[PDB]
Amino acid sequence: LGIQGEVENLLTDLNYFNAFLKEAAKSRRENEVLKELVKKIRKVVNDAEDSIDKFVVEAKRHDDTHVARAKGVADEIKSIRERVKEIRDNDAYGLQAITLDDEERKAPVVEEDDVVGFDDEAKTVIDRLIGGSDYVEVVPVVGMPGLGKTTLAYKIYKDPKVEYEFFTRVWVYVSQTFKRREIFLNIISKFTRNTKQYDDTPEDDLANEVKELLGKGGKYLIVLDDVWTMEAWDRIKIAFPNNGKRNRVLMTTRQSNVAKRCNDKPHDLKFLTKDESWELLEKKVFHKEKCPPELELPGISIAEKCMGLPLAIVVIAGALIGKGKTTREWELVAASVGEHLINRDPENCKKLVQMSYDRLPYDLKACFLYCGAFPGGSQIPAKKLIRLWIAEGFIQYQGPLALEDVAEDHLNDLVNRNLVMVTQRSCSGQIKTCRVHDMLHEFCRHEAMMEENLFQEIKQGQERSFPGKQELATYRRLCIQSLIPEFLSMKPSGEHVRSFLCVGSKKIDMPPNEIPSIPKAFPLLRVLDAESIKFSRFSREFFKLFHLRYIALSTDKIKTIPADFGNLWNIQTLIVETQQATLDIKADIWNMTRLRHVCTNASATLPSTNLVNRCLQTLSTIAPECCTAEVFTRTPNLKKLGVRGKIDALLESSKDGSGSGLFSNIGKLGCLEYLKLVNDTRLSSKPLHLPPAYIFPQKLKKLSLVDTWFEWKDMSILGLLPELEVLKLKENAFKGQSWEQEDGGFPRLQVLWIERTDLTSWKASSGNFPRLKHLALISCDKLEELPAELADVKNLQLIELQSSSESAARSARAILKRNQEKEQDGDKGTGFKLSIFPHDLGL
Amino acid sequence: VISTLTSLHGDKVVYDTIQAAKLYPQLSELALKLEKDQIRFWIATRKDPSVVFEALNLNWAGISIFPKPEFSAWLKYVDDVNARHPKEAPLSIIP
Numbered sequence: 062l063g064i065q066g067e068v069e070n071l072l073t074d075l076n077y078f079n080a081f082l083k084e085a086a087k088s089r090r091e092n093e094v095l096k097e098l099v100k101k102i103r104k105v106v107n108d109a110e111d112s113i114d115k116f117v118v119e120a121k122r123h124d125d126t127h128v129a130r131a132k133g134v135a136d137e138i139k140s141i142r143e144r145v146k147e148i149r150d151n152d153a154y155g156l157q158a159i160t161l162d163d164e165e166r167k168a169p170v171v172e173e174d175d176v177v178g179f180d181d182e183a184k185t186v187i188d189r190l191i192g193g194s195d196y197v198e199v200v201p202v203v204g205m206p207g208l209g210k211t212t213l214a215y216k217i218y219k220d221p222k223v224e225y226e227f228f229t230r231v232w233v234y235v236s237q238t239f240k241r242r243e244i245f246l247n248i249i250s251k252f253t254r255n256t257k258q259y260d261d262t263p264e265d266d267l268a269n270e271v272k273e274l275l276g277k278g279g280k281y282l283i284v285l286d287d288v289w290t291m292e293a294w295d296r297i298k299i300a301f302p303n304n305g306k307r308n309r310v311l312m313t314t315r316q317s318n319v320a321k322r323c324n325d326k327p328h329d330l331k332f333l334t335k336d337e338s339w340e341l342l343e344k345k346v347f348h349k350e351k352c353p354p355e356l357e358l359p360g361i362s363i364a365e366k367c368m369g370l371p372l373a374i375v376v377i378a379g380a381l382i383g384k385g386k387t388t389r390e391w392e393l394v395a396a397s398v399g400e401h402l403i404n405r406d407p408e409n410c411k412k413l414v415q416m417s418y419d420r421l422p423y424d425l426k427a428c429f430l431y432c433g434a435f436p437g438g439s440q441i442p443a444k445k446l447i448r449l450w451i452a453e454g455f456i457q458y459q460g461p462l463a464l465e466d467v468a469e470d471h472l473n474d475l476v477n478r479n480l481v482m483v484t485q486r487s488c489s490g491q492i493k494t495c496r497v498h499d500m501l502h503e504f505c506r507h508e509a510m511m512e513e514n515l516f517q518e519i520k521q522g523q524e525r526s527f528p529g530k531q532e533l534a535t536y537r538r539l540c541i542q543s544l545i546p547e548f549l550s551m552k553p554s555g556e557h558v559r560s561f562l563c564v565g566s567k568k569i570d571m572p573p574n575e576i577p578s579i580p581k582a583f584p585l586l587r588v589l590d591a592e593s594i595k596f597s598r599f600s601r602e603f604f605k606l607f608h609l610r611y612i613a614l615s616t617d618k619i620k621t622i623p624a625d626f627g628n629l630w631n632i633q634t635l636i637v638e639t640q641q642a643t644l645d646i647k648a649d650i651w652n653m654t655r656l657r658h659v660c661t662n663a664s665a666t667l668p669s670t671n672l673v674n675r676c677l678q679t680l681s682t683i684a685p686e687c688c689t690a691e692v693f694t695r696t697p698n699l700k701k702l703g704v705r706g707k708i709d710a711l712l713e714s715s716k717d718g719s720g721s722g723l724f725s726n727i728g729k730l731g732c733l734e735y736l737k738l739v740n741d742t743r744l745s746s747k748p749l750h751l752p753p754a755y756i757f758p759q760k761l762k763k764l765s766l767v768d769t770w771f772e773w774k775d776m777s778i779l780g781l782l783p784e785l786e787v788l789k790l791k792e793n794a795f796k797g798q799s800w801e802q803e804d805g806g807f808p809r810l811q812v813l814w815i816e817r818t819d820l821t822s823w824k825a826s827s828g829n830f831p832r833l834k835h836l837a838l839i840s841c842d843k844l845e846e847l848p849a850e851l852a853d854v855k856n857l858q859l860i861e862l863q864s865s866s867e868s869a870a871r872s873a874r875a876i877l878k879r880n881q882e883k884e885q886d887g888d889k890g891t892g893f894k895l896s897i898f899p900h901d902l903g904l
Numbered sequence: 905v906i907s908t909l910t911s912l913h914g915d916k917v918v919y920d921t922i923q924a925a926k927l928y929p930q931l932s933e934l935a936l937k938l939e940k941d942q943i944r945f946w947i948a949t950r951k952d953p954s955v956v957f958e959a960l961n962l963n964w965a966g967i968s969i970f971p972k973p974e975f976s977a978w979l980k981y982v983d984d985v986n987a988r989h990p991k992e993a994p995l996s997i998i999p
């Protein structure tokens with residue numbers, strides 16, 4: 062077809078435009094004409110992508126009103142092709158201008174006096190500078206932008222203890238861009254003032270001269286302010302002598318990857334507390350005088366909203382001084398703290414954040430700004446965030462690694478660059494939940510709304526209303542926290558909307574008549590993050606989202622996903638937080654090649670299946686009766702099952718001579734790494750048995766068993782798993798009065814979680830937990846006492862007990878005493894803590 | 905060997921495809937030899953340096969051209985065709 066050719070020539074043009082945009086994002090464009098040129102090219106790039114998507118999907122529909130739809134597609138592709146040629150003909154000079162792009166050393170200025178709340182931090186780093194090996198050791202101070210790294214570094218740099226200890230103290234302002242030669246000349250200028258003799262000396266010979274100067278000066282400290290790369294550290298460190306005189310390097314940086322590679326345990330800077338934020342703000346606004354009582358109430362609120370960041374407090378203090386000393390004006394600043402940081406003061410907050418943001422790779426920028434779609438101060442599930450980047454299309458990677466492994470590397474890269482903060486880390490070390498600081502969150506909102514137009518918030522404000530069709534013709538994605546039912550009531554027309562992110566934290570039971578609003582208003586809906594919205598029924602419009610990649614919804618009345626779901630071939634992630642105990646997926650989802658997750662909450666009875674689902678990774682809950690041989694043939698690269706239902710059929714063996722059950726199929730997966738089991742049988746009194754380990758999965762890493770009533774005798778078979786690291790038992794997962802362990806087992810086990818155990822006694826051996834780190838005993842009221850062999854674990858870190866009996870508390874005290882004695886014998890503690898209340902009983 | 909699989913109706917897309925196939929261990933040896941065969945085509949017909957300059961995607965770089973290894977291979981290309989030129993007319997990177 063000639064239409065196929067038209068899309069081909071269009072695609073080559075966008076190949077140049079996308080390459081132009083990627084190289085245009087490598088640095089900030091300050092010229093206003095270039096800014097609009099980038100916005101125009103980005104707009105036509107996006108709109109062309111929205112039209113090729115219409116062509117490729119409609120072609121897929123045509124393979125299985127078609128004339129009219131094809132005519133409309135060809136008419137559209139004709140229009141964008143004309144618009145592309147319009148840019149290439151009229152804006153031809155402009156495209157060259159950005160292509161043909163190519164100073165003063167702005168060393169930061171910090172508080173020399175009135176440094177609030179850094180006394181403890183300064184002493185911690187100073188005492189760390191004193192100790193260590195005689196060789197060169199680095200003490201990197203790492204944190205988010207504007208945290209006070211240079212302020213603490215200068216506090217240490219001028220500290221009387223440091224000035225006495227270190228004869229030579231050098232401050233070097235490293236940065237994103239620097240001259241390796243000028244740094245060595247700067248250090249040399251500290252000692253000898255004759256600069257004319259080094260006019261032609263090579264750089265490496267200058268580094269040799271720096272070596273002689275620092276070496277003769279005895280023990281020395283060097284403040285490498287704002288080192289951005291490890292390559293810069295290697296280039297500069299060649300001039301630092303290793304004389305064996307305990308000389309140190311204090312390396313403030315925003316990068317944790319650089320910090321860790323210079324010292325294994327980087328020093329992370331702290332945030333100011335709520336009391337310290339008000340003390341600093343009051344000091345900045347008022348010159349050595351107390352706050353008036355009328356201004357104390359709004360001033361405290363402002364300091365709280367700065368989230369303990371000294372940069373935000375200093376910026377907001379400049380606004381407060383200009384706004385007089387009136388309660389009304391200080392109330393206006395409190396209502397718009399974020400606006401005064403980024404928009405009103407671009408030199409202080411906006412420009413400093415741009416240093417880290419513009420340094421990101423082009424793919425990481427779309428991922429970082431996407432974190433600002435969620436409400437300010439909220440905590441984002443890391444698993445949910447990862448699947449959002451991949452489903453949207455920010456993870457463009459063509460290597461052999463799985464996409465979620467690459468995205469997890471991207472998320473860890475953002476955390477390493479301290480653009481994202483981790484709240485919860487799993488015992489295995491992975492990221493569980495993350496949040497963006499309030500200053501960076503306003504940057505993410507402003508950047509992805511006005512400059513990049515990545516997403517748009519929808520709210521009913523005083524000066525803002527629900528956008529009209531003139532605004533919706535521009536919006537790429539929508540995020541909305543509240544008032545969703547009324548926005549869907551007015552029947553919007555989001556033609557170019559690729560995402561609908563209901564980032565609200567409160568469940569909303571939408572009326573059934575507004576259900577088809579979401580799929581009918583946004584035909585190009587790729588990502589539908591409707592996790593908070595409760596849907597009681599489906600509709601044919603809901604299954605017309607042929608461009609859909611991500612779908613999350615919560616149901617109470619929907620007992621079965623209809624087979625119409627199978628028309629959406631582009632979906633990757635399925636999430637259904639259904640409260641029902643049963644759920645049937647009628648759709649033939651096996652033919653969706655890019656299907657990756659099925660995070661059901663009930664026993665999923667998948668339908669019956671030369672083709673391989675190479676991408677499928679996770680099944681949260683599946684029916685045991687659906688564990689056919691064909692199912693596991695299609696999922697070789699899968700990495701997690703979950704089995705909820707009647708486990709009796711899983712373990713029962715027929716009398717026809719076949720002694721292998723459905724568990725044999727589970728163990729044949731050569732890439733499994735997570736298994737979860739939930740048993741529904743409760744009327745029977747049978748305690749269950751566990752199959753032998755030679756039919757278990759070879760590469761299983763994590764387990765989680767709930768309410769299965771396994772006998773305590775058969776988990777010595779579970780100890781034969783060589784690569785087991787995580788094990789969770791919940792809701793009386795095991796039954797029996799006595800627990801005894803055989804020799805060996807758990808060669809790599811790291812965490813064991815137990816809730817509502819049925820046992821009363823437990824006996825163990827020293828070889829059972831060679832590498833155990835964490836043990837959890839929650840609601841274990843039946844526990845009499847713990848075995849004393851648990852104190853032989855050298856790698857143990859934490860044992861936590863909740864609602865334990867009096868005798869169990871005595872055993873916990875005895876184990877704690879033995880662990881304390883062993884640690885006091887010469888083994889440094891790993892940070893043990895124990896929950897006891899009251900402390901006076903049993904002392 | 906067949907001219908159909910050598911002309912390929914383009915050179916820049918082929919060059920990018922060869923680099924993309926290079927990250928796969930099972931395609932590293934095939935992509936490496938095919939990369940050399942692309943240079944064979946560059947020498948056989950003596951295309952203008954403008955085409956090879958765009959094929960290497962050196963068109964987006966400021967002061968960073970020299971440190972880029974693609975610039976070094978771009979210099980090695982003009983040296984190679986200056987040892988295989990059909991006529992003594994010089995070929996230069998400067999234009």
Ligand SMILES: Nc1ncnc2c1ncn2[C@@H]1O[C@H](COP(=O)(O)OP(=O)(O)OP(=O)(O)O)[C@@H](O)[C@H]1O
Binds near residue numbers: 169172179375
């Ligand atoms: N403890 C503090 N008391 C008072 N002001 C502080 C404190 N810490 C930082 N500030 C102020 O915060 C602002 C930014 O702090 P600082 O210059 O130390 O940034 P930083 O953490 O080194 O960041 P960057 O990575 O951007 O260099 C400065 O104006 C500084 O005066």
